[PDB]
Ligand binder design. Structure first.
Ligand SMILES: OC[C@H]1O[C@@H](O)[C@H](O)[C@@H](O)[C@H]1O
Ligand SMILES: OC[C@H]1O[C@@H](O)[C@H](O)[C@@H](O)[C@H]1O
Ligand SMILES: OC[C@H]1O[C@@H](O)[C@H](O)[C@@H](O)[C@H]1O
Ligand SMILES: OC[C@H]1O[C@@H](O)[C@H](O)[C@@H](O)[C@H]1O
Lengths: 217, 218, 218, 217
């Protein structure tokens, strides 16, 4: 029972590039792949996806979202790919991704993220690809990647990483350890020195405790 | 065990856009996603994918392939997406897709295909999306789509369909009966009149046997 | 005199990517390069650029403009580059570029243009690069490019050219004659067959009147 | 007589992204805009550009150049834009830019520059924009910018400025005095405190003489 603005066949619903200001009503409950990208959507109602439990791929990139409701994805237990790139988010609510236990790809690039909440990714045991590039992050909270045992590809470049603050040391030691999975481009290419210290141009992985201080935090 | 030209982490190997003239040796057996697109590969050796039984997605688009070896995909029983868009193929060998019983997406657009072999798609019981747009096809062999029970999206536009010839009548009847799945664009948009007759720019789905003739076949 | 929203030094004013809904007030009259791309502008107020006669480069790309007022560019006698790529325009008003006699680059790609007004480019004696790719154009009005004596680079691909209709023949003879300037990509790469007939996949330069009809002109 | 690898129409030659190891022969003498970016060029042949006296724009960014011949630009009297971003240069030879008297844009970012020759920019009376960000620079020679009367935009961020050493005082006083033109981004955004001290992450323009010592240099 397709939204008039969209095309629907099978389990795919394509509403992309239709100048929409909100998520249309009447997206079928059988939908598995939902394209809402490249619109002008300015917010998501809490509840807007409560009925779309069969989603595996959700494309929200290229909209104008400025925050997300904390429980907006809680019913999407089948979700495998989530693309939020190129919105205007500055933060993510605690618990946003907690129910997404089958998620394998998460695109967060090209926003204004300035921090991530501790535990943001703790439930994502299946996550393989995480894009955090081209945001405004200055550090990653301690242990933010410790429960991502499936991660094989991460993008961290093009952030203003603050390597003067002792807060960097989780990320420096993590990239040093996991350098094989740090890269850039689409599809991913290996690029472990692409996370750079915004002040000094030193690779994040090369930062040492002795050069940092808590008073620069 | 990555070829030096490529990047490899986890089960993905990215050799895209590396000016490669052939598929590099040493792609790991555990590979699931393999990007070979946007190179200068002009032929594939038989056997090249024989070790890569774990592949789920194989991207061969944007090369200069002018033929495919007949059994080149025979060991890829797990394959779900195969993209051959934008190569230079004019035909496909009989049997080529027979082993791809789990294939869900097949991209053949933007080549020079002038015909498809009879039975090309008969084994693809799980196929969902089939792209045949932007080729040089004039008709579809009788019963070509009869064993595609999973098909939900097909692209047939931008081909010079020959609507004078009796051979068009399978495709015309087919499009009429499956109009909900025929479209255009990426991702797909609904467009059932987008398969058009070369001589009149009339929709293919409107053709009836009253206007076709066996003597108008080339 | 910098708008608070933007950065200004020299004769360059950068208001790009600032989530703007309108052209900010007080852009200094000395401005030569104005970046207003990648915002949320849906319309322009008539007069908006009347004080900015010193502009040489105007960047409007990546907004959501739905139309342009007919004399919005009339005072920009110094303009050399004008970029309107990736807006939502479906047409252009008569005379819109008439005053832009020093224009050298004009980007009109990736919109929804369904036609070009007659005489749209007739005053653009210095135009060198013209991007019309990725629109909804079906044909070019007879003689539309006759007065572009400095044109060296044109992009015409990704439009649904209607080669069944007799009206295509201006454009087919023109691309045939000027094939060395037809291309794709940024920066431009040579690609003379990239303008294709939407119905048949024949290159537009290859079309002749043996295959067209005046009765097939919707 | 267009090189086989390239596309040429009018006065523009596009040889970008073609795996070239050298500049191809047969670039026309009438060429005004030359794209050689994004190739595999590690060195240029002496004289390679001597015939190309009509160039206005020369894109060399994204190669792997390790050095430049001192006279390689000498015949380019009409050059207005010169992009060398993202090569591997560590130094520049004396007088490299001396003949480029019409140059308006000069891109030197994203390399490995560890110093600039004094006098490097002394002939660039028309230079408007100068990108020096993302290198390894520790200071700027006394009077380096004194003959850049047209400069309106300079990027100095992401370099490890040594603010202990008295050699910084030319740059700190210059940035304090020309703070209106110091910025970041593409296109330029105003960011006067984006030049930062290596050991403190404090702004280079806030450096006092009392905090320095000629000893560390
Ligand atoms: O998976 C995330 C990746 O997504 C792409 O869309 C993006 O260009 C990359 O920069 C990276 O973020
Ligand atoms: O999956 C088939 C589709 O694939 C896209 O890559 C292509 O641009 C479409 O026109 C269609 O062929
Ligand atoms: O001059 C117009 C050109 O503008 C570019 O931004 C675009 O990618 C090209 O496709 C072409 O239209
Ligand atoms: O003119 C130089 C400028 O060039 C851009 O290409 C680069 O992103 C900037 O960071 C700045 O250096």
């Amino acid at each position: 029972a397709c939204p008039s603005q969209c095309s629907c066949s099978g389990t795919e619903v394509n509403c992309a590039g239709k100048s929409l200001a909100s998520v249309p009503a009447g997206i079928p409950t059988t939908t598995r792949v939902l394209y809402l990208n490249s619109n002008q959507i300015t917010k998501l109602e809490p509840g807007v996806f409560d009925r779309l439990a069969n989603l595996r791929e959700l494309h929200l990139w290229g909209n104008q979202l400025v925050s997300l409701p904390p429980g907006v994805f809680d019913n999407l237990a089948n979700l495998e790919k989530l693309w939020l790139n190129s919105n205007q988010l500055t933060s993510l609510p605690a618990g946003l991704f907690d129910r997404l236990v089958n998620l394998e790809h998460l695109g967060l690039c090209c926003m204004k993220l300035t921090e991530l909440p501790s535990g943001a990714f703790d439930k994502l045991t299946r996550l393989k690809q995480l894009g955090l590039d081209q945001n405004q992050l200055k550090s990653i909270p301690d242990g933010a990647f410790a429960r991502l045992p499936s991660l094989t590809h991460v993008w961290l470049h093009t952030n203003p990483w603050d390597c003067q603050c002792t807060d960097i040391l989780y990320l420096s030691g993590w990239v040093a350890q996991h350098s094989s999975i740090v890269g850039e481009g689409w599809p991913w290419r290996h690029s472990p020195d692409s996370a750079k210290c915004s002040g000094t141009n030193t690779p994040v992985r090369a930062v040492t405790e002795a050069s940092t201080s808590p008073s620069k935090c």
